Amino acid sequence: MNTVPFTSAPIEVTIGIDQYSFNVKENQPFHGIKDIPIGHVHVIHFQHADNSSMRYGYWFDCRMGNFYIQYDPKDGLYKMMEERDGAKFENIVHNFKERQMMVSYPKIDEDDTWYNLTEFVQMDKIRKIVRKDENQFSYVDSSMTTVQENELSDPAHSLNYTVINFKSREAIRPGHEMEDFLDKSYYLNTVMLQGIFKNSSNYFGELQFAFLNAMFFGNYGSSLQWHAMIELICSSATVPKHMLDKLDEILYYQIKTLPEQYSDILLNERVWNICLYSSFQKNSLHNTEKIMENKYPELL
Amino acid sequence: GAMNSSNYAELFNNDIKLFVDDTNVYRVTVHKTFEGNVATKAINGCIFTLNPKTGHLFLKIIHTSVWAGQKRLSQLAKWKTAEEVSALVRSLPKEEQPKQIIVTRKAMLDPLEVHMLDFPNIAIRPTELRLPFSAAMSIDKLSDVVMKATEPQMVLFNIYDDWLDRISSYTAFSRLTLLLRALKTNEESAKMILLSDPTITIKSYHLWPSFTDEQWITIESQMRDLILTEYGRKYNV
Numbered sequence: 206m207n208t209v210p211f212t213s214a215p216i217e218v219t220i221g222i223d224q225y226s227f228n229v230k231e232n233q234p235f236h237g238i239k240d241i242p243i244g245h246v247h248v249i250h251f252q253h254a255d256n257s258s259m260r261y262g263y264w265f266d267c268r269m270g271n272f273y274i275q276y277d278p279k280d281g282l283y284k285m286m287e288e289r290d291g292a293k294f295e296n297i298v299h300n301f302k303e304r305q306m307m308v309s310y311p312k313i314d315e316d317d318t319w320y321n322l323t324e325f326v327q328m329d330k331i332r333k334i335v336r337k338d339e340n341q342f343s344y345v346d347s348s349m350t351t352v353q354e355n356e357l358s359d360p361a362h363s364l365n366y367t368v369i370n371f372k373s374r375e376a377i378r379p380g381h382e383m384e385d386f387l388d389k390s391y392y393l394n395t396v397m398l399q400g401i402f403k404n405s406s407n408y409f410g411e412l413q414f415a416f417l418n419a420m421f422f423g424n425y426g427s428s429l430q431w432h433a434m435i436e437l438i439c440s441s442a443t444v445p446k447h448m449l450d451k452l453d454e455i456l457y458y459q460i461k462t463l464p465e466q467y468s469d470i471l472l473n474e475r476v477w478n479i480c481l482y483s484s485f486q487k488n489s490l491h492n493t494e495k496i497m498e499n500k501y502p503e504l505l
Numbered sequence: 506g507a508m509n510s511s512n513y514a515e516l517f518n519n520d521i522k523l524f525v526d527d528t529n530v531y532r533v534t535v536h537k538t539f540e541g542n543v544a545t546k547a548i549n550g551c552i553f554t555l556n557p558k559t560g561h562l563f564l565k566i567i568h569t570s571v572w573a574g575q576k577r578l579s580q581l582a583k584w585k586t587a588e589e590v591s592a593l594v595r596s597l598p599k600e601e602q603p604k605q606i607i608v609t610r611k612a613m614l615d616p617l618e619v620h621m622l623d624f625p626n627i628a629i630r631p632t633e634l635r636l637p638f639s640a641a642m643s644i645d646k647l648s649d650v651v652m653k654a655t656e657p658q659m660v661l662f663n664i665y666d667d668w669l670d671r672i673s674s675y676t677a678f679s680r681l682t683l684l685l686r687a688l689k690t691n692e693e694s695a696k697m698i699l700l701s702d703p704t705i706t707i708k709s710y711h712l713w714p715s716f717t718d719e720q721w722i723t724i725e726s727q728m729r730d731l732i733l734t735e736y737g738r739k740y741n742v
């Protein structure tokens with residue numbers, strides 16, 4: 206179990222750690238989060254009490270370094286930093302725990318929710334989508350645009366998701382125009398899976414990461430990316446059986462976790478109705494269809 | 506974006522554009538089988554591709570063999586249309602290729618956009634105009650070449666005959682759409698108007714009769730009357 210120490214909490218803020226969240230009052234004696242499960246990526250995220258605008262946060266893996274949060278009064282945000290002196294870090298954390306100045310990552314032992322949302326998400330792939338090689342953790346916020354959005358403006362601060370575009374020469378073979386547009390199996394299996402992602406695990410990893418950025422930061426381009434990667438699978442007549450079964454599980458836990466009250470802005474009616482009721486895979490996503498119909502029948 | 510009454514003169518500026526109408530590509534007769542079921546029999550069709558500024562009509566004849574062994578023919582027909590328009594564009598010299606293609610039915614937008622991905626600078630647009638180009642097969646010489654075709658074939662026409670020697674392309678397009686609207690509303694009546702006077706003939710190289718300017722004004726009035734006539738017959742007004 207690892208720990209992320211907070212130098213202090215000088216400004217009132219709602220702090221998220223994965224799917225959990227809690228309020229910290231201005232100058233409250235808060236020194237961080239302990240008992241963070243090893244083996245998963247994690248995200249620690251922030252919304253200031255005085256300007257709920259700009260949710261922001263950090264994707265990190267405690268196996269890759271000792272990380273802490275310190276508020277920067279010049280840039281006005283809580284910043285993740287790496288402590289390279291391991292003894293200084295262990296000493297600091299031990300003091301914080303002994304004085305019980307830390308919240309405990311509150312994992313119920315029956316609960317696989319975080320694993321199920323991050324099964325295929327790997328820090329190394331996050332760091333290619335979010336380019337800032339001098340840090341081992343990755344900053345994301347509500348306003349960051351994607352490389353595709355910038356085509357349709359600062360490149361250093363972009364989300365470099367894999368560009369998916371159904372009406373593009375990449376998606377459509379000359380002489381198979383109708384075939385490739387109505388059945389996207391070529392684009393999914395040869396172009397994307399074999400060509401770019403190399404395997405379905407990496408594809409699912411980017412899909413899951415896009416969803417989590419959409420949910421935790423309200424990042425619109427991430428939501429677009431998540432729906433495009435769903436739609437590409439659902440619009441393909443030939444998909445490996447293990448990918449369909451895994452997609453159904455992935456989406457089930459995403460729909461389960463989504464705040465009921467954000468469904469109107471995080472779910473695209475067209476895509477979900479097409480995917481569940483018109484697409485080639487309309488009968489292949491049994492768990493997802495059942496939770497969607499019982500939780501968000503309005504959208505359908 | 507879409508083409509409508511506000512930007513209507515755009516059709517007659519000097520940027521090359523084509524209308525594409527697919528309403529006569531997939532054509533069938535519906536009949537009873539010996540068992541008393543219903544079946545269709547395809548008949549030849551055509552793509553109606555028109556430059557509204559010059560009158561040039563690229564009539565691609567769609568022979569029934571192109572449907573043999575194919576499923577979902579109404580969907581295929583839109584993609585076949587897009588395939589043939591793309592082939593036409595690729596066959597033209599660069600300086601003759603259109604800058605815009607206006608499809609008369611919104612269902613042609615994605616098929617044509619996909620077939621034209623190689624031409625990112627050609628705009629593919631819909632229109633809110635209700636144009637009567639489905640009535641092209643009421644023009645006898647067009648219907649004749651389509652029905653006689655035994656193989657795929659492209660035939661070129663000027664749908665304005667020699668009108669542009671005397672009138673502008675705005676006026677010529679207006680005459681064409683009035684004639685086609687009449688033929689669509691009451692084909693028999695419209696053809697009687699056009700051909701009742703045996704002294705006015707159709708030149709071998711033309712589609713329409715050789716009316717004088719004064720005769721066109723009469724013909725045009727007779728077509729408006731017909732359209733108003735049928736409107737009252739239809740609605741009891």
Ligand SMILES: O=C(C1CCCCC1)N1CCC(NO)CC1
Binds near residue numbers: 273275288293294297
């Ligand atoms: O929290 C602290 C201070 C430790 C000493 C008492 C006051 C707080 N750190 C300072 C910056 C860090 N460096 O590793 C880690 C965080």
